[PDB]
Design a protein around this motif. Structure first.
Motif, PDB file in Angstrom:
ATOM      1  N   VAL A  54       0.827  -1.208   0.000  1.00  0.00           N
ATOM      2  CA  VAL A  54       0.000   0.000   0.000  1.00  0.00           C
ATOM      3  C   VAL A  54       0.854   1.247   0.000  1.00  0.00           C
ATOM      4  O   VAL A  54       1.664   1.456   0.909  1.00  0.00           O
ATOM      5  CB  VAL A  54      -0.968   0.002   1.238  1.00  0.00           C
ATOM      6  CG1 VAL A  54      -1.756   1.337   1.316  1.00  0.00           C
ATOM      7  CG2 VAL A  54      -1.878  -1.213   1.172  1.00  0.00           C
ATOM      8  N   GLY A  55       0.681   2.080  -1.023  1.00  0.00           N
ATOM      9  CA  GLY A  55       1.370   3.345  -1.082  1.00  0.00           C
ATOM     10  C   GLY A  55       2.855   3.221  -1.372  1.00  0.00           C
ATOM     11  O   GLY A  55       3.607   4.114  -1.056  1.00  0.00           O
ATOM     12  N   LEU A  56       3.277   2.126  -2.003  1.00  0.00           N
ATOM     13  CA  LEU A  56       4.702   1.900  -2.253  1.00  0.00           C
ATOM     14  C   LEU A  56       5.077   2.451  -3.615  1.00  0.00           C
ATOM     15  O   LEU A  56       4.302   2.323  -4.542  1.00  0.00           O
ATOM     16  CB  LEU A  56       5.046   0.402  -2.209  1.00  0.00           C
ATOM     17  CG  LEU A  56       4.578  -0.384  -0.966  1.00  0.00           C
ATOM     18  CD1 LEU A  56       4.900  -1.906  -1.075  1.00  0.00           C
ATOM     19  CD2 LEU A  56       5.216   0.212   0.258  1.00  0.00           C
ATOM     20  N   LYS A  57       6.256   3.049  -3.737  1.00  0.00           N
ATOM     21  CA  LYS A  57       6.719   3.502  -5.056  1.00  0.00           C
ATOM     22  C   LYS A  57       7.719   2.466  -5.533  1.00  0.00           C
ATOM     23  O   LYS A  57       8.758   2.309  -4.911  1.00  0.00           O
ATOM     24  CB  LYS A  57       7.363   4.901  -4.990  1.00  0.00           C
ATOM     25  CG  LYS A  57       7.986   5.394  -6.318  1.00  0.00           C
ATOM     26  CD  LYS A  57       8.544   6.801  -6.168  1.00  0.00           C
ATOM     27  CE  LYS A  57       9.233   7.259  -7.448  1.00  0.00           C
ATOM     28  NZ  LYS A  57       8.282   7.256  -8.607  1.00  0.00           N
ATOM     29  N   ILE A 101       9.432   4.763   0.305  1.00  0.00           N
ATOM     30  CA  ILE A 101       8.348   5.231   1.150  1.00  0.00           C
ATOM     31  C   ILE A 101       8.803   6.505   1.872  1.00  0.00           C
ATOM     32  O   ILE A 101       9.966   6.914   1.770  1.00  0.00           O
ATOM     33  CB  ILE A 101       7.927   4.170   2.159  1.00  0.00           C
ATOM     34  CG1 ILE A 101       9.137   3.771   3.043  1.00  0.00           C
ATOM     35  CG2 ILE A 101       7.302   2.943   1.394  1.00  0.00           C
ATOM     36  CD1 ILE A 101       8.810   2.649   4.127  1.00  0.00           C
ATOM     37  N   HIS A 102       7.889   7.131   2.597  1.00  0.00           N
ATOM     38  CA  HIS A 102       8.143   8.492   3.053  1.00  0.00           C
ATOM     39  C   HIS A 102       7.681   8.672   4.492  1.00  0.00           C
ATOM     40  O   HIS A 102       6.637   9.231   4.731  1.00  0.00           O
ATOM     41  CB  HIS A 102       7.449   9.474   2.101  1.00  0.00           C
ATOM     42  CG  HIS A 102       7.951   9.392   0.678  1.00  0.00           C
ATOM     43  ND1 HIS A 102       7.337   8.619  -0.288  1.00  0.00           N
ATOM     44  CD2 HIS A 102       9.027   9.952   0.078  1.00  0.00           C
ATOM     45  CE1 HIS A 102       8.008   8.715  -1.426  1.00  0.00           C
ATOM     46  NE2 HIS A 102       9.041   9.514  -1.229  1.00  0.00           N
ATOM     47  N   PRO A 103       8.470   8.201   5.458  1.00  0.00           N
ATOM     48  CA  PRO A 103       7.965   8.249   6.835  1.00  0.00           C
ATOM     49  C   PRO A 103       7.703   9.678   7.336  1.00  0.00           C
ATOM     50  O   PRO A 103       6.849   9.870   8.212  1.00  0.00           O
ATOM     51  CB  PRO A 103       9.089   7.616   7.653  1.00  0.00           C
ATOM     52  CG  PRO A 103      10.012   6.973   6.682  1.00  0.00           C
ATOM     53  CD  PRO A 103       9.783   7.532   5.339  1.00  0.00           C
TER      54      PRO A 103
HETATM   55 MG   LIG Z   1       3.804   6.088  -0.710  1.00  0.00          MG
END
Ligand SMILES: [Mg+2]
Ligand SMILES: O=C(N[C@@H](C(=O)NO)c1ccc(-c2cc(F)c(F)c(F)c2)cc1)C1CCOCC1
Ligand SMILES: [Mg+2]
Ligand SMILES: [Mg+2]
Ligand SMILES: [Mg+2]
Ligand SMILES: [Zn+2]
Length: 889
Positions: A54-57, A101-103
């Protein structure tokens, strides 16, 4: 909108044996490389390989080191990575990927995120898929080998599960650490933490194998002096599991880590437990008393998970109560034994019968093992946790300690290292039941209905005594109201712990007795009963039910004074209050409806008031218990007994009853408030963070309760006491002085003073926010607006948002203002919060849970706001699903 069904459980067509991760944290992004060593299971039917993600580039993905190409060989839709079956190997293979991802901008606090200057994960229930691709379900057990790299100055401390096996330098000011965790685990127990953390540590030597275990507790540097109690609690937890259950910790190290931003209380990641700071950090100067019991219970709770949830884990998420109900039960046993105060068990019951009973009679009602879900983030409920714990605790009541311990060990020995289901636990208990009953035909098949049947049973009683025969009978009936889950409810296995009290001398007339009610009704007869007794029913609150004791107030008073069981004394008092509340409520309602110019109210029973005085004046009686008997039942407990509840009329009712009792007892209250000071506020151990006295904290609770009653009553010159109280070193005291000063012109003087005392400690400021939020102020809306503009602002910290708004929602007169302005305010906050944290937005819906229990005007106002929230185009899946169920749409 996918619905998952419990009946649909099927093992995966795939196996993940090894996970090898490299997590490289950079300034503006985190790069995650993963190699999964996989296989085809016996259940495989040539399906596509589908990963959660989910939400992975995607930077790249590969199978056996051959790059896969989008469109032809895989599709990704930001939720599922689908690799078409023709490209999936038919024996052992390696899947690899690199994603970004973008913590830093992950404000939902699930997956990998940044809390202040700490990078931290939260993977339960399905957050691992927000970090990398996986078959994200708890029956996919694997070994983990995890490397983390990061800027060394920003992130000198690196932690993950297992043993740290390498530490190394990297060019450009970076550094890495490698963690290998060979025992199989589900992915929701994966964790990683990176930060400038400071610690306290100790060594614990286990009881039987004498293994050395290193214990570490971590926080940001600013609060490292608030860590000591947590470490003590961890030691206590380890000893309890050893002493009660004979279970020792199996790993060489256990880390506890506090972070400022957390959706719940804490998380049991293996060897790496992660805590909301408010449930790990405390000091006597900067925390209220409640923090000390909180930290004890939450440190205990996560430690007990190491067996119940970690070593024995879940087959699927429908089994959640198997690890949560059981760990809450273990947590509660532990807390009762550590605090040695009867109010600990009472506080658990008080919580269940207010919040969980409300849930169980709402449109949200579900059994502790639901049949379906849409949102896992909405599954972690007081029903699954607290009713689950009472269901787990009933096994102990039924079996007694010796056979319960035998059955529990059967469960552990048989399921250690594996997934399990609720049936596995019931089976272990059943084996002990057979042994206890000396009857291999005995069974607990009926007990399984506690897992499947929703709603609270009602148990009611009738009595008969024959004086010539010396024979006493208790006739019992059980009934559960039909709801949307079962049209026909079946009778449950209900254990009823009972005593019989001689009303002439207060003595026990029979030995310890647990009635096993297994039918819709039964009659229990006792011979050689010399005199007509008063029954002491459901001692210890022995089942999670509505108790209708059918006793007179005279009988209840006798129990309140003379019974041996704390819960029945407290329940007897509760029942006297409820009879009064219902009576006065309807007298007030009638006056309102009929527009009466005059009318009568039935006064509080004077013998009841006499009994409260008697108990208050008894120096051998418990201060905590005393604080309960002078408090009316919770509003959320009362609402289960009233249809179309007019909250104004309830507010008037409570006010009348408090005034009745205070008109007789205020001088007693004041005398006690003064006499309790020396012991309650004793400073001998104020600078010893490991010395915690639960009795002394209960004395402070009693004083602060009495002060509240005397302030509301405007007892002569009480403001003097309030002002001196504000000078106490204990935050419980000086925050109390702020909220009781609401009734005086000095409130804003005390507002500023206590703000200044609170503002430089993150957690204390949040306690100050709650105190303000819950203040009984006519200008509370203007005050909330001030908190928003001056203190809260656009913080996304859930502790901040919950502190400002939730206590206010318990303000009966003001939150439920007939204009609907309070409902409007909380819905705006919910909708705002839902943009960045759906799980917390749903928590903020809590006041709406009783919407269809209120008077018809307020039902309409609440329903309007919920429909307004449901119409927001950008509403989250969490919030939509929740409000749809709550409004029966
Ligand atoms: Mg993402
Ligand atoms: O913190 C608590 N419960 C957590 C628990 O059981 N720890 O062992 C808990 C942990 C994680 C979640 C959780 C579930 C999700 F689906 C999710 F997305 C998430 F971020 C957290 C909810 C509750 C409660 C409050 C403190 O005492 C224990 C009960
Ligand atoms: Mg010991
Ligand atoms: Mg608890
Ligand atoms: Mg902050
Ligand atoms: Zn838990």
């Amino acid at each position: 909108p996918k619905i998952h069904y419990r009946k649909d459980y099927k093992p995966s067509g795939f196996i993940i044996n090894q996970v090898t991760l490299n997590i490289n944290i950079h300034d503006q992004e985190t790069i995650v490389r993963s190699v999964l060593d996989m296989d085809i299971s016996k259940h495989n039917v040539g399906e596509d390989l589908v990963f959660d993600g989910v939400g992975l580039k995607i930077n790249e993905i590969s199978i056996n080191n051959k790059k896969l190409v989008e469109g032809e060989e895989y599709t990704y839709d930001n939720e599922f990575l689908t690799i078409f079956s023709k490209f999936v190997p038919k024996s052992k293979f390696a899947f690899s990927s690199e994603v970004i991802i973008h913590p830093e901008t992950n404000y939902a606090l699930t997956g990998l995120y940044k809390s202040k200057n700490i990078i931290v994960s939260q993977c339960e229930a399905t957050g691992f898929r927000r970090i990398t691709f996986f078959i994200d379900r708890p029956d996919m057990m694997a070994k983990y080998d995890v490397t983390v790299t990061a800027d060394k100055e920003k992130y000198p401390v690196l932690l993950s599960n297992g043993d740290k096996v390498n530490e190394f330098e990297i060019p450009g000011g970076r550094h890495g650490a490698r963690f290998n965790d060979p025992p199989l685990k589900p992915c929701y127990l994966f964790a990683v933490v990176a930060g400038d953390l400071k610690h306290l540590s100790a060594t614990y030597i286990t009881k039987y194998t004498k293994k050395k275990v290193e214990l570490y507790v971590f926080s940001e540097e600013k609060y490292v002096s608030k860590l000591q109690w947590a470490l003590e609690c961890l030691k206590k937890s380890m000893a309890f599991d050893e002493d009660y259950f004979g279970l020792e910790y199996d790993l060489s190290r256990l880390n506890l880590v506090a972070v400022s931003d957390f959706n719940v209380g804490a998380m049991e990641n293996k060897g790496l437990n992660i805590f909301n700071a408010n449930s790990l950090l405390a000091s006597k100067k900067n925390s209220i008393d409640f923090s000390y019991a909180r930290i004890l219970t939450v440190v205990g709770h996560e430690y007990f998970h190491q067996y119940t949830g970690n070593r024995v884990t879940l087959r699927d998420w429908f089994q959640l109560t198997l690890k949560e109900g059981l760990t809450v039960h273990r947590e509660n046993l532990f807390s009762e034994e550590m605090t040695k105060t009867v109010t600990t068990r009472l506080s658990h019951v008080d919580l269940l019968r207010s919040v969980q009973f409300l849930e169980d009679s709402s449109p949200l009602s579900h059994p502790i093992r639901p049949e379906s879900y849409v949102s896992m983030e909405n599954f972690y409920t007081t029903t699954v946790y607290d009713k689950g714990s009472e269901v787990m605790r009933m096994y102990l009541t039924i079996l007694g300690e010796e056979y319960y311990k035998k059955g529990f060990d059967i469960y552990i020995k048989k399921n250690d290292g594996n997934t399990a289901t609720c049936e596995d636990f019931n089976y272990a208990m059943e084996q002990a039941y057979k042994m206890k009953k000396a009857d291999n035909s005995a069974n607990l098949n009926q007990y399984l209905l506690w897992f499947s049947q929703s709603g609270t049973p009602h148990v009611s009683f009738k009595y008969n005594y024959d004086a010539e025969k010396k024979q006493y009978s208790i006739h019992v009936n059980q009934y559960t109201k039909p709801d949307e889950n079962q049209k026909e409810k079946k009778p449950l296995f209900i254990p009823i712990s009972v005593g019989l009290i001689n009303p002439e001398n207060g003595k026990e007339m029979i030995s310890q007795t647990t009635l096993e009610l297994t039918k819709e009704s039964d009659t229990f007869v006792f011979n050689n009963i010399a005199v007509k007794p008063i029954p002491s029913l459901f001692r210890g609150f022995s089942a999670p039910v509505y108790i209708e004791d059918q006793l007179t107030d005279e009988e209840r008073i006798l129990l309140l004074k003379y019974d041996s069981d704390a819960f029945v004394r407290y329940n007897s008092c509760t029942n006297i209050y409820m009879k009064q509340i219902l009576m006065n409520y309807n007298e007030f309602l009638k006056a309102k409806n009929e527009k009466l110019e005059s009318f009568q109210l039935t006064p509080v029973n004077a013998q009841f008031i006499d009994a409260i005085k008697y108990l208050l004046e008894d120096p051998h009686a418990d201060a905590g218990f005393k604080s309960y008997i002078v408090s009316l039942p919770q509003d959320r407990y009362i609402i289960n007994f009233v249809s179309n509840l007019d909250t104004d009329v309830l507010a008037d009712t409570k006010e009348y009853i408090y005034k009745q009792i205070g008109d007789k007892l205020n001088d007693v209250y004041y005398k006690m408030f003064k006499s309790l000071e020396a012991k309650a506020d004793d400073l001998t151990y104020f600078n010893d963070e490991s010395h915690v006295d639960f009795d002394q904290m209960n004395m402070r609770t009693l004083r602060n309760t009495l002060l509240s009653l005397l302030s509301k009553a405007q007892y002569p010159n009480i403001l003097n006491e309030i002002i001196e109280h504000s000078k106490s070193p204990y935050p419980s005291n000086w925050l109390t002085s702020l909220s009781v000063s609401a009734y005086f012109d000095k409130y804003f003087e005390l507002y500023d003073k206590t703000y200044k005392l609170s503002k430089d400690d993150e957690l204390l400021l949040q306690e100050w926010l709650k105190t303000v939020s819950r203040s009984d102020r006519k200008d509370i809306y203007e005050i909330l607006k001030k908190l928003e503009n001056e203190v809260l602002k656009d913080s996304k910290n859930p502790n901040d948002i919950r502190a400002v708004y939730l206590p206010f929602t318990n303000n009966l007169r003001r939150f439920h203002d007939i204009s609907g302005k309070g409902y409007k305010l909380i819905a705006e906050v919910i909708t705002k919060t839902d943009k960045f944290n759906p799980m917390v937005a749903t928590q903020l819906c809590e006041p709406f849970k009783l919407w269809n229990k209120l008077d018809t005007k307020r039902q309409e106002l609440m329903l309007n706001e919920m429909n307004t929230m449901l119409q927001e185009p950008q509403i989250s899946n969490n919030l939509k699903e929740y409000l749809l169920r709550l409004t029966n749409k």
